[PDB]
Amino acid sequence: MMKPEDVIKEQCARAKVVAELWHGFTGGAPKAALENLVVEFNKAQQGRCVRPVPQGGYRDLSTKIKAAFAAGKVPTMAQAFENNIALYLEAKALLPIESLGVKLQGVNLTFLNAVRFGGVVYGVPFNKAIQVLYYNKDLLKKHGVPVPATLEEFVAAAKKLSRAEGGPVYWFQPDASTFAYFFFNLGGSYLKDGKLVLNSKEAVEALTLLQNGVKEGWAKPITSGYINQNLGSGPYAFSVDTSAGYTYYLRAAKFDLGVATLPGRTKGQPGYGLVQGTNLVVFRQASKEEQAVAKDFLEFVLSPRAQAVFATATGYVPVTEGALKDPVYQAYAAENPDYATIVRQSRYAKFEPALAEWEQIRFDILGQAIKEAILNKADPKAALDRAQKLAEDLLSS
Template sequence: MKKIVWIMAALTLVSLAFAQQKAEDVIKAQCAKAPVVAELWHGFRGGAPRAALENLAVEFNKMHEGEGCVRPISQGGYRDLSTKIKAAFAAGTLPALAQAFENNIALYLEADALMPLDDVITDLDQLNPLFVNAVRFDGKLYGLPFNKSVQILYYNRDLLKKHGLEVPRTLEGFIETARKLSAAEGEPVYWFRPDTSTFSYWFFNMGGSYLKDGKLVVNSPEAVKALETMVNGVKDGWAKAITSGYINQNFGKGVYGFSTDTSAGYSYYLKAAKFDLGIATLPGSGDKPGLGLVQGTDLIIFQDVSDAAKKLAGEFINFVSSPKAQALFSAATGYVPVNLKAIDEPALQDHLMDNPDFKVVIEQANYAAFEPAIAEWEQIRFDILGQAIKEAVLGKASPQEALDKAQKQVEDLMAGRIR
C-alpha cells in the first residue's frame, strides 16, 4: 500500500510557528485586532479540510495584518450551512464569504444577493474551465471553484491479481468483471451506496441528462436503465448496497472489489483498507474514461456587506486559488487542485511522488459531469430522487415506479404545489 504523506504542518506559504490544532485560536486573536473582519461560513465539520482552510486563513491574515482578517466559521455540514444562510437572509446577518454548491448559487441569485467575480479573480485563465463554467449564470461568474472532488474507481488490487483480471475500462467490462469476481468469491464485490451520487455515475455514462428541452426530467429511459443496473446488480449477486456508514467503514464485512466514489474519500479508504487499494479513472466507453460526478463547493461573496469586507474577500479568494495555495490544499485534503498550474508546485509534486495514484484524480477531473444548477436541486437530490433510488434498490418499488413518482414530485415542487 502506498504511503500517505500528510503535509498539514506545512500548509502555509511560509512555515507556521504554531501547532496546527491552534489555528482557530490564532485566527480569533488575529481578528480581534483587525479593523475589518470578513466571516467565511463553511461546511467543514473537521479533519483535514477544516484544518487546511484554517491554516490558509492564518497565513492570509498574517499577510494582511493591520488591514483586515478573514475568519472561517464552521456551520456544521453542508445542508446545515445552506439552512443557516437562508436564516441569515431573513435576519440580515449574512457573512462576507461562504461555501456554496452551484444550486445554492442559483437560489441566492434569485435574491440578487451575490457579487459577480469576473473582475475580482485575477488569474481566471489558470483555473479548470470545466469548474469555472459550472459557476457562470447568464454569462457572469458568481463563484470561485474551491474544494472540488470527482468520482473515481476504487478497487482491490489483491483480488484482481488473485483471479488474473485487469482493471475494467468500459461499463460492459466493469459489469463483466464484477460478475466474474462475485461468482468466484461467492458474494457481491461491487459495493455502492444507494444514493444520487452512485446513480449519477451510471446515469451520465449511459447518456443521461437531467435537462430536456428546458425541463427537469428524472424518469428518462436513461435514468430507468441506470437504476435498473443498480437494482439488478443486487438481485444478480454482483453488487452490494451499503446502507449504513461509508463504504470504507464497512471493509472487513465482506469481499470488497470495487466502488465508484468521491476522490475526497481517498485518504479514508487508504486508512481502512487491509488490502492493496488502487484507484483508476472510471470505466467509460471506448478508450475514454467515464464521466465522474463533480462534488464540492465554490466560494461566493455576498453583496450585503461593507465595501471593505468585499475587497478583503476578493483578495482572499485570489489567495486561496493561487497555484501554491491550491497545491498545498490539494495535497493535504485530496481535493482536485482547481488551479491548473498547481501541478508544477513542489508541494504537489512531492505529494505525487509519494502517492502516484493521485495522478488519477487529476486526470479524472478532465472528464467531469455536473448536476443541475437550479435552486430546487438540493431538495430534489436528497428528498425526492435520493428517496426514489433507495426505494428501488431496497425493493420497495420498481425503478420505473420509483422514478415516475419522483418525476411527479419534481413537477409539483417546481410548480410550487409542494415544498
C-alpha cells in the same frame, strides 16, 4: 492541545476586519487543509483576517444560510454548489466575482462555466472533486482480475469477484451521486430542451443496472455512513466515489487501496465522473473592508501553492493550470500516482443541473426514488415516474 482554529481565533481577535467564511467540512483532511490555508492567509495580512465557521455538512450549511437570510445577517463568504448559487441569485444576495477584482484567467473552464449565470461569474471554484474508482488492489490480484476499464468489464469483474468471495464486492450508496455515474455513462442527460426529466429511458436503465446488481449478488448497498466507514466487514473490491474521500479511504482501508479512472462505455476514454465540492461566493451585505479581505482571500485561494497544498492534502482537483506547474504539486504527483490519476479523471467530468430547487430534488425526490428501488425493491420506472411527478409539482409551486 493547540490546533489551527486556536491560531485562527487569536489572529481574528487581534484583527481590525474579520470576513467570516461559512463551510460544510465536518473534519478530516478537508477541514484541516481549509484551516491551514486560512492560518497562512491571515499571517500575511496586517489585521485583515478570515474566520472559518463550520456549519456542519453541505445540507446543514445551505439550511443555515437560508436561516441567515431570514435573520437578516449573512457571512462574508460561504461554500455553495452551483444550484445553491442559483437560489442565492433569486434574492440578488451575491457579488459578481470579476467586479471584486479577482482575476480568473487560468481557472479550469469546466469550473468557471459552472459558476457563470447569464454570463456573469458568481463563484470561485475552491474545493472541486471528481468521482474515481476506488479498488482493493489485494482482492483483484487474489483472483487475477484486471482493473476494469469499461462498464462491461466492471460488471464482469464485480460478478467474478462476488462469486469467489461469497459476497457483493461493488459497494455503493443508493444516492443521486452514485446514480449520476451510471446515468451519464449510459448516455443520460437531465435537461430535455430545458425541462428537468428524472424518468428518461437512460434513468430507468441506470437504476435498473444497480437494482439488478443487488439482486444478482454483486452490488452491496451501504445504508449507514460513507463507504469508507463501512470497510472491514466482508469483501470489498470497488466503489465509485468522490476524490475528496481519498484520505478517509487511505486511513480506513486494511488492504492496499487502488485509485483508477472510471469505467466508461469503451477503452477509448474513461467514463464521466460527477463533479462535486463547492465554490466560494461573496455576499452583497458584506462591508467594503470585508469585501476587500474576500478579494485578497479568493486571490490567495487561486494561487498555485495554495491550490497545490489544498489538493494534495485532500484529493480535491487543483482548479488552475498554474497549480500543476507548482513544485509542491509536482513532488507529490511524483511520489503518489493517485494525484495524477485524480487529475486525469478530472478531464472526463459532468455536472448536475444548476436549478435553484436541485438540492431539494437530488436528496428528497431523486435520492428517495433510488432508495425505494434499491432498498424497498420498487420497480425502477415506477419509482422514477413518481420522482418526475414530484419534481414537476415542486417546480410548478
